[PDB]
Amino acid sequence: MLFFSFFKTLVDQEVVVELKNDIEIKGTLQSVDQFLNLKLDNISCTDEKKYPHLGSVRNIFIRGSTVRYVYLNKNMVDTNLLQDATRREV
RNA sequence: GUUCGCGAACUUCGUGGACAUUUGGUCAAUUUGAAUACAGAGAUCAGCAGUUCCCCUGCAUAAGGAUGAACCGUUGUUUU
Predict the structure, then answer these.
(1) Number of domains, chain A
(2) Which CATH number does the domain housing residue A41 bear?
(3) Using CB atoms within 10 A as the burial measure, which of A43, A45, A59, A82 is most buried?
(4) Residue A19 CA to B80 C1' — how many Å?
């Protein structure tokens, strides 16, 4: 519920998502749910070989388990609030 | 006395003017114990940068504005 909240707080965000099977895709995050899935608007290029065989796909739904990271910058994410939340929880 | 003019028989008589003078004119230079010299030793043409003041142009520093750029940021067996 902490992490879900955090994800929600990142609504409307151009972020790169590296998947398990060598798939790195950029996109503007829209919807966030209990199991941490990502629907990204406007799919753009990150790398040439790793980026998968898509083109006209402008909207996607990433399965939450298959993500390795969610590549944020240092100007795109919460931190000591998260820490506080963690502390509060057991 | 010395010249120029005119009257009478170049020559001479009768005659009217004019007749000072010197200072102010030393080549220097060198060889002398008068000779050599011989007037005395860079020119002209043309660039460029400098200096000052201005104007433009580009950069730098100071300051001081104006404005842009998407989008949210931080304190009982499949997604654990």
Answers:
(1) 1
(2) 2.30.30.100
(3) A43
(4) 15
